[PDB]
Design goal:
binds calcium ion; Flagellar associated protein (chains A, B); mainly alpha; homotetramer
């Protein structure tokens, strides 16, 4: 379920530090700009 | 370190569709601009 | 919080096949 | 991939204390108890 996985990802994002979000953002940008 | 959480998030992005990544991006922008 | 991580884990268990849940169960058993 | 998610979950178990793993174990019993 993409809805279920997205919910889990959202919960986990809040446990990441600002520096970690750089890498998440980069992965997103490589997929959808 | 946050490396376990970052690993899990990065792994799970591969289970999400392109349209789902937009929501992750919004949550990142909410925090770091 | 650690609680937020726990709830993410619980949600992800619903994505796993029975055989992968056995693997998780075994790791938990060896820890506790 | 189910194995992809499995290894994500395994990494996250390292962020949990033994006390928290009890709830994970109980959830697993709801899903594959007796199997
Ligand atoms: Ca938000």
């Amino acid at each position: 379920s993409t809805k279920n996985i997205l919910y889990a990802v959202m919960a986990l994002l809040g446990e990441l530090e600002d520096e970690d979000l750089v890498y998440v953002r980069r992965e997103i940008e490589q997929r959808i700009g």
